[PDB]
Enzyme design. Structure first.
Site, PDB file in Angstrom:
ATOM      1  N   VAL A   1       0.826  -1.200   0.000  1.00 36.83           N
ATOM      2  CA  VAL A   1       0.000   0.000   0.000  1.00 36.83           C
ATOM      3  C   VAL A   1       0.869   1.261   0.000  1.00 36.83           C
ATOM      4  CG1 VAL A   1      -0.118  -0.010   2.508  1.00 36.83           C
ATOM      5  CG2 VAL A   1      -1.824   1.253   1.190  1.00 36.83           C
TER       6      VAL A   1
ATOM      7  N   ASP B   1      10.095  -3.286 -14.690  1.00 36.37           N
ATOM      8  CA  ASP B   1       8.640  -3.254 -14.679  1.00 36.37           C
ATOM      9  C   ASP B   1       8.070  -1.889 -15.016  1.00 36.37           C
ATOM     10  OD1 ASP B   1       6.045  -4.330 -14.334  1.00 36.37           O
ATOM     11  OD2 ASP B   1       5.994  -3.517 -12.289  1.00 36.37           O
TER      12      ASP B   1
ATOM     13  N   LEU C   1       5.177  13.190  -6.249  1.00 36.65           N
ATOM     14  CA  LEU C   1       4.754  13.843  -7.494  1.00 36.65           C
ATOM     15  C   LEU C   1       3.244  13.633  -7.552  1.00 36.65           C
ATOM     16  CD1 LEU C   1       7.857  13.028  -8.300  1.00 36.65           C
ATOM     17  CD2 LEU C   1       7.130  13.950 -10.491  1.00 36.65           C
TER      18      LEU C   1
ATOM     19  N   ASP D   1       0.418  10.456 -12.272  1.00 41.04           N
ATOM     20  CA  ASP D   1       1.185   9.462 -13.017  1.00 41.04           C
ATOM     21  C   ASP D   1       0.757   9.569 -14.483  1.00 41.04           C
ATOM     22  OD1 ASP D   1      -1.035   7.468 -13.639  1.00 41.04           O
ATOM     23  OD2 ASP D   1      -1.058   7.348 -11.446  1.00 41.04           O
TER      24      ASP D   1
ATOM     25  N   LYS E   1       5.654   4.001   0.915  1.00 35.47           N
ATOM     26  CA  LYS E   1       5.247   2.684   0.458  1.00 35.47           C
ATOM     27  C   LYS E   1       5.578   1.640   1.522  1.00 35.47           C
ATOM     28  CE  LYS E   1       7.605   1.038  -2.925  1.00 35.47           C
ATOM     29  NZ  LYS E   1       8.167   1.019  -4.316  1.00 35.47           N
TER      30      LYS E   1
ATOM     31  N   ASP F   1      10.355   3.511  -8.970  1.00 35.71           N
ATOM     32  CA  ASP F   1      10.628   2.102  -8.677  1.00 35.71           C
ATOM     33  C   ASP F   1      11.824   1.447  -9.371  1.00 35.71           C
ATOM     34  OD1 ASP F   1       7.104   1.181  -8.129  1.00 35.71           O
ATOM     35  OD2 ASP F   1       8.500   2.465  -7.030  1.00 35.71           O
TER      36      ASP F   1
HETATM   37  C1  LIG Z   1      -4.782   5.356  -8.552  1.00 37.27           C
HETATM   38  C2  LIG Z   1      -3.418   6.011  -8.354  1.00 37.27           C
HETATM   39  C3  LIG Z   1      -2.341   4.931  -8.315  1.00 37.27           C
HETATM   40  C4  LIG Z   1      -1.241   5.341  -7.348  1.00 37.27           C
HETATM   41  C5  LIG Z   1      -0.570   4.093  -6.770  1.00 37.27           C
HETATM   42  C6  LIG Z   1       0.659   4.496  -5.948  1.00 37.27           C
HETATM   43  N1  LIG Z   1       1.748   4.901  -6.855  1.00 37.27           N
HETATM   44  C7  LIG Z   1       2.465   5.930  -6.597  1.00 37.27           C
HETATM   45  C8  LIG Z   1       2.037   7.219  -7.045  1.00 37.27           C
HETATM   46  C9  LIG Z   1       2.825   8.399  -6.771  1.00 37.27           C
HETATM   47  N2  LIG Z   1       2.447   9.586  -7.173  1.00 37.27           N
HETATM   48  C10 LIG Z   1       1.429   9.844  -8.229  1.00 37.27           C
HETATM   49  C11 LIG Z   1       0.072  10.040  -7.607  1.00 37.27           C
HETATM   50  C12 LIG Z   1      -1.058   9.325  -8.092  1.00 37.27           C
HETATM   51  C13 LIG Z   1      -2.330   9.514  -7.496  1.00 37.27           C
HETATM   52  C14 LIG Z   1      -2.427  10.420  -6.423  1.00 37.27           C
HETATM   53  N3  LIG Z   1      -1.348  11.127  -5.929  1.00 37.27           N
HETATM   54  C15 LIG Z   1      -0.122  10.927  -6.526  1.00 37.27           C
HETATM   55  C16 LIG Z   1       4.057   8.251  -6.029  1.00 37.27           C
HETATM   56  C17 LIG Z   1       4.866   9.329  -5.725  1.00 37.27           C
HETATM   57  N4  LIG Z   1       6.218   9.142  -5.572  1.00 37.27           N
HETATM   58  O1  LIG Z   1       4.403  10.440  -5.583  1.00 37.27           O
HETATM   59  C18 LIG Z   1       4.469   6.956  -5.594  1.00 37.27           C
HETATM   60  C19 LIG Z   1       3.693   5.795  -5.866  1.00 37.27           C
HETATM   61  N5  LIG Z   1       4.106   4.650  -5.458  1.00 37.27           N
HETATM   62  O2  LIG Z   1       3.896   3.567  -6.182  1.00 37.27           O
HETATM   63  O3  LIG Z   1       4.772   4.533  -4.325  1.00 37.27           O
END
Ligand SMILES: CCCCCCNc1cc(NCc2cccnc2)c(C(N)=O)cc1[N+](=O)[O-]
Length: 294
Positions: A17, A123, A79, A82, A33, A141
């Protein structure tokens, strides 16, 4: 949290998560994470810790590796969006070519950096590419796959996406090379251009056959050694290759040329990130500001 305050659940990533959190001391906002399952191999702790030194503007910074209370947390720079969400948001009109080019160029710089430091992603997918309001895009990642050897799942039974997997992985090669990342990025480049996934397989064999139906079933001519691969079967159907003009219309020849080199079957013939940066497609690259609604 001993130093954090959860802002909200960002999602349930491939390795546990993920939460948006604020460091109660520094006040900085980060992505936290929680890593999945019952032991946490110290081997992985050392390898992951090494990634903290892998700094580049197109790589999401790994701020901390916290191994406390026998649990593993990865703290990353945050950030807001995505690329998967951005592509969906831009579905009606499409991402402008100048921005597609800027993003591809930046992602290749990120890969060139990681690869020169012997770090593979393995990946890559739109969901692992993060963007900000400044027009930057960063890879998230990198190196976790190796540090955690086997992938498996997330922690809440979620369907692993195979859409961006290189053919050598699908054919059972046990040794991944930097080329697997170039393949994935090529698939993403195509998807940004057409607004449809290039190879949306729903099973390992469907993934492989979707690739074969488009690029032609590989043989010893285009891929020396393919017939000796672990999961290769002489019984695979033999499909003829299609023209790129039909695969990623209306992308121009510079773009089709670069994509074709990123999608060569033989990992050894596949273009490197460094070489790709020099491709004529980037002659007029710029850094546009994306229309981001947060
Ligand atoms: C449905 C959204 C999927 C996100 C799953 C998690 N995936 C991630 C998304 C991130 N940010 C983009 C974001 C996306 C949505 C809302 N707020 C920020 C970040 C980060 N480093 O800022 C890290 C991870 N992750 O994998 O550690």
């Amino acid at each position: 949290m001993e130093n954090f305050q959860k802002v909200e659940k960002i999602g349930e990533g491939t390795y546990g998560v993920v939460y948006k959190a604020r460091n109660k001391l520094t006040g900085e906002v980060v992505a936290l994470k929680k890593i999945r399952t019952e032991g946490v191999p110290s081997t992985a702790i050392r390898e992951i810790s090494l990634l903290k030194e892998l700094n580049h503007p197109n790589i999401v910074k790994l701020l901390d590796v916290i191994h406390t209370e026998n649990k593993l947390y990865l703290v990353f720079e945050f950030l807001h969006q995505d690329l998967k969400k951005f592509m969906d948001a831009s579905a009606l009109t499409g991402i402008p070519l100048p921005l597609i080019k800027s993003y591809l160029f930046q992602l290749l710089q990120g890969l060139a950096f990681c690869h020169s430091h012997r770090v593979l992603h393995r990946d890559l997918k739109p969901q692992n590419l993060l963007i900000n309001t400044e027009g930057a895009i960063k890879l998230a990642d990198f190196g976790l796959a190796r540090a955690f050897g086997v992938p498996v799942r997330t922690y809440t039974h979620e369907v692993v996406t195979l859409w961006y997997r290189a053919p050598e992985i699908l054919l059972g090669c046990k040794y991944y090379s930097t080329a697997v990342d170039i393949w994935s990025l090529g698939c993403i480049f195509a998807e940004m251009v057409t607004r449809r996934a290039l190879f949306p397989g729903d099973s390992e064999i469907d993934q492989l056959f979707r690739i074969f139906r488009t690029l032609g079933t590989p043989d010893e001519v285009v891929w020396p050694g393919v017939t000796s691969m672990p999961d290769y079967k002489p019984s695979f159907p033999k499909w003829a290759r299609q023209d790129f003009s039909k695969v990623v219309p209306p992308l121009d020849e510079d773009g089709r040329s670069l994509l074709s080199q990123m999608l060569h079957y033989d990992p050894n013939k596949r273009i490197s990130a460094k070489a790709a940066l020099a491709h004529p497609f980037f002659q007029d690259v710029t850094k546009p500001v994306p229309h981001l609604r947060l």
